[PDB]
Design a protein around this ligand. Sequence first.
Ligand SMILES: CCCCCCCCCCCCCCCCCC(=O)OC[C@H](COP(=O)(O)OCCN)OC(=O)CCCCCCCCCCCCCCCCC
Ligand SMILES: CCCCCCCCCCCCCCCCCC(=O)OC[C@H](COP(=O)(O)OCCN)OC(=O)CCCCCCCCCCCCCCCCC
Ligand SMILES: Nc1ncnc2c1ncn2[C@@H]1O[C@H](COP(=O)(O)O)[C@@H](O)[C@H]1O
Lengths: 50, 98, 52, 48, 120, 320, 49, 63, 80, 347
Amino acid sequence: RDHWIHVLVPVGFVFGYYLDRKNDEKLAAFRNKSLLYKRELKPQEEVTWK
Amino acid sequence: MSLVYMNIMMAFTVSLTGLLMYRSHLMSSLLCLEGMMLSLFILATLMILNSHFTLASMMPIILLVFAACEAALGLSLLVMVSNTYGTDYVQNLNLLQC
Amino acid sequence: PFFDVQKKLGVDLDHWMTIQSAEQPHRIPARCHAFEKEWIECAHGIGSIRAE
Amino acid sequence: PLNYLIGGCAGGLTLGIGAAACAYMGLTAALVKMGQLEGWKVFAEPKV
Amino acid sequence: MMTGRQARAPLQFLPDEARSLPPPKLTDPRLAYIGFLGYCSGLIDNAIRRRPVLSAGLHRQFLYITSFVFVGYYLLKRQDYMYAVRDHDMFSYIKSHPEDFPEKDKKTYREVFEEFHPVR
Amino acid sequence: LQYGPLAYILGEKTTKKMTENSKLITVDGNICSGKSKLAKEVAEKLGLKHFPEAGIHYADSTTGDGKPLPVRFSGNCSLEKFYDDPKSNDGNSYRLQAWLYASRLLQYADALEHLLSTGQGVVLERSIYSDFVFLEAMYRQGFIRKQCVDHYNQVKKVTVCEYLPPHVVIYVDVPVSEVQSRIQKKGNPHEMKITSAYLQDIENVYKGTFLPEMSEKCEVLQYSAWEAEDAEKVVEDIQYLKYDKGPWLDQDDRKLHNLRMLVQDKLEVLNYTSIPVFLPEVTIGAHQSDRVFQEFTELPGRKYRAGYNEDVGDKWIWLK
Amino acid sequence: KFYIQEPPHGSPNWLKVGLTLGTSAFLWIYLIKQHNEDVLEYKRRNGLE
Amino acid sequence: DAPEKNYERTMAILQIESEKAELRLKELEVRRLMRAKGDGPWFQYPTIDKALIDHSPKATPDN
Amino acid sequence: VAAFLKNVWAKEPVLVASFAIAGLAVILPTLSPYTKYSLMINRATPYNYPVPLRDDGNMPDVPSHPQDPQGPSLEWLKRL
Amino acid sequence: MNPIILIIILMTVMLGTIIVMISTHWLLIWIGFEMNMLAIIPIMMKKHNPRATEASTKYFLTQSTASMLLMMAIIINLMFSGQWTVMKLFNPMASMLMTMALAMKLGMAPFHFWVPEVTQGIPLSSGLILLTWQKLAPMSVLYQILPSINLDLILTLSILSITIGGWGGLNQTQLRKIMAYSSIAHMGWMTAVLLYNPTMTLLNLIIYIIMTSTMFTLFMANSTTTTLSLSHTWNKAPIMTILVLITLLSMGGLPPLSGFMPKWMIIQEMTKNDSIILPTLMAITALLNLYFYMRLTYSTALTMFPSTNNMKMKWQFPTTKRMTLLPTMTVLSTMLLPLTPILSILE
Ligand SMILES: CCCCCCCCCCCCCCCCCC(=O)OC[C@H](COP(=O)(O)OCCN)OC(=O)CCCCCCCCCCCCCCCCC
Ligand SMILES: CCCCCCCCCCCCCCCCCC(=O)OC[C@H](COP(=O)(O)OCCN)OC(=O)CCCCCCCCCCCCCCCCC
Ligand SMILES: Nc1ncnc2c1ncn2[C@@H]1O[C@H](COP(=O)(O)O)[C@@H](O)[C@H]1O
């Protein structure tokens, strides 16, 4: 690419953004288990948040 | 504790005080150091013969041999000092102040 | 740093001179063979804090 | 604490340099007083 | 502290009971950080001998990265083993002395009195 | 390196190549003694490798492409400006003399390294043992200061004690009249400005200071202007010497291994030339040193280590 | 040529480069084999199959 | 991000960190008791191995 | 390896004799048949008291009197 | 020196330290210290100048006095215990003598008066050995006798070592004496945490040896022995300029560098045991070490620059010196702090 350096920071954002999503599945210990936001699952739904 | 052991310890501390207050020579330091080694030999020997602990009887000889070799090393150091200044004076050994 | 090589490899380099109750030449006893044997068999394996 | 602060500054006036030794020995004797009050250990025994 | 544990089996870098533990993954962030330290050692090695830092010695930088990852994998295995031994001994000593570790009666704040200090 | 302690372990002993022809011979004389032909003549009779006299650009000739660099990178000093104004303001006198001492130190290191790596002797022209004889002759003319002589004696005291003296010192007697005759017949318009008493003081520190102290540590051979013209008489004087003085005789493989490891490390040879003794003729400030260094890095072949420069055609760099 | 003296690194030391790449590849394949044997041993000791 | 996700993620974070803090207090108390009494697996400073003692009949009987 | 040996026997017979005596002192205790008898004599020399054993009932190899058949005998030492 | 003789003597130094490390018997501890001293004496006299003979004489006198005091402690242990196991000592007199003797072998204050002298007298590689390898054997004996070490004595020696290694670094332009007073201060740091957690003793020891080895390797790569000679590094090798100084910013004890890893962990083990005043005072004195060593950092990366003209010749020659493990030791002495819980491998 003629301007390959200009994707070090944007793609470096996206992967970083990606890792935050990758951490959220490790902090899913109380998904649909809180006394406030718990509910029955809708059809075509397997988790409340991802 | 015991009495003759206290005497050999007293000799060890007396040769220590002679080893910790230098007068003029490095040979005096090596002599006080080997008087310390002698008192260690005497006290180890009296303990090992007292308890009839048999296998430790080779220990003072070991305590002799190494330390006598140690004294040889010290003598050689003194000689190199006496090859630079002509005397073995400890006040010629003060170039490492700076 | 006590790298116990003598227990890893299975060599006896200096355990024999360590205590009086070890295997002496011509089975000579020490003066305090029984007392040291009883202190060692009492204080064995329980650690220094309990052994004191 | 304040009395040993006065005592530290009294030891500092007979030390000289004057006001610095006053403040230093006063704060040090204050720490001695507060260690006697709250039980502060300088050579603390190994406990854990 | 735990030197009585490594006294009946001395000089074992990884005991057999360490095999009962999960090893670190090859995408471990700690292991990738050790590989980053290998890449940094390669760049400093090409810098201090005045080589083109990114270009020269790609086999040498590859061996720096590989050697740091190789030593660091076993260091992470031993780290995980030692903290597992620490927690295992902790839990066994808690289970073996209930009288030294009583269950504290948890009181709700409707019983717990706290002195209110007004801020004004 | 190529030679190291492992090569000494594996059997590369440097007394195995020490033969009777392995002699380091230093030819000395005045400015136009005409010894520069004579030394070359010895190089074609004894089979010795001739090293020319170390000028401003010796280190330029040893490294890189072998060409002389511009003067701002090497020297920052001129011989012809010393010929024009020796009492100059900016101090070209001691700066040129200290750069020549460093260049002759690199020459003497190359001489011993060739002698110990090949066993072939080296003919040198005005080695480091005969360099102070210019400095003193400069200080007797007021061209430098006493602090310059102190700085040079410091550098010499910490550098020349690591080495051996040469085997043969060939000295040439040419008086000041014939020296001036050859300078005026030479044709260099700058070199003809050399005064008479400066050449006289060169010859005085030659005869009264250099040669008597070289007489104990080695064997000197002294010639006039016309008997030095014959090369065969000089070679017959060299070969029929009986080498009996000097510290070359008590040289085993350990001392010569230490010396050979010393001289191949060029930064350890040239270490104490630039000691931090702040003298205004040699002290360069931070901005000038920074600017000259960054201009040195962009020279062709000087950006990296020698096998690593793409601008001069180095291949296989990504595998080195 | 460009240089008046031959540098010690003008040519790649093929024995040294070959030993470097071979030792690095050996450490990689031994590391991968060790990790596979460790995950097999973990799943065999703790029953996660 | 949703308030549901942030809320339940905060609850998971507080669970992990409160568990680690309880275990750190237990770590301090276990270390204090094992140093004080010496009956745990830690602080086991070595004594003399009794596999070194000779039990053969000696030269004199009284030992 | 033979002319060198004659040369070193000509120049330095003292060191040749020393290395020959030291080499024989090394190798000959293993090439000897009588070496085992040294071990046997040193382990059959009674510096201590032969402390007797309580007769539990089944020990056929242990005698009851010194003039009994069974027991370690030194007929080889008396005869040789 | 003959290189085969050098290899034999260095393996004998390593053998003496290993015999101190692996032995269950006190006579072999003493034998290993004697072997270590006997073999390290020619390492100091590698160059054969009078300062090395003076340094070796002072080293011989101090280490011989420490060896005889160690043997007296062993003999008093054999009185009051009749045995030879390297374990806790069975007399506080023998405990005090062995603690004093090991403080002499380490050069802990007030027995520090030989450390800046001898390190000044000897070359940089022998000073590297004296300040890295020779710490390993007495710290191992202190690791093995800690149920008998007096608390007040080891804390007195620790804080006195940290204060004197702090105030020794003011008046010095010599790099070797600055490394020696840094040695004294760090030995006070190591023996501060010995009776509380000896894993942090080994962590401080390993981080100290890595930083000291990086600094002496940089000093050997640049052949600089004084501050003023170190000040010419920016014009000769500019990559050498900062690595010395980020390693020395590590050696002060400063985050996020890994030299902040020991001291913090030491404080982390002393606030557990209810000592708040003592780590506060010791790390204020570590800030005093930062004060003087940051002044040296200002000396090299900044103001006192100027060069001489012969440096222009050194630009035409690279370093052919062996900078062995210097990138590895420079990475391991700065960027190791995010791997701080690796310390569990030292249990
Ligand atoms: C393995 C068994 C145990 C061996 C160890 C115990 C040996 C006991 C004796 C110890 C002697 C210690 C000193 C030995 C030094 C040897 C080196 C030596 O002396 O070299 C110099 C010498 C040349 O002589 P020169 O230098 O002139 O003497 C000065 C006076 N003129 O050179 C010589 O003279 C050559 C000397 C070396 C070669 C001698 C070969 C003797 C072979 C005898 C038959 C085979 C014996 C079997 C073992 C092999 C031994 C090599
Ligand atoms: C629980 C932990 C147990 C213990 C773990 C292990 C501890 C290791 C402690 C290492 C101490 C090493 C001291 C130095 C090495 C000893 C031999 C030596 O000095 O070699 C250097 C060598 C000498 O060459 P020479 O020619 O004399 O150079 C002077 C100028 N002529 O060559 C040179 O001078 C070349 C210059 C570079 C030398 C670099 C040497 C670095 C060695 C240490 C590496 C870091 C420590 C080991 C890894 C971490 C473990 C703590
Ligand atoms: N003080 C000095 N004055 C002039 N020339 C000198 C001095 N010191 C050394 N030289 C060198 O000696 C050379 C003269 O020798 P030649 O090449 O025989 O003419 C000059 O060209 C300089 O390179």
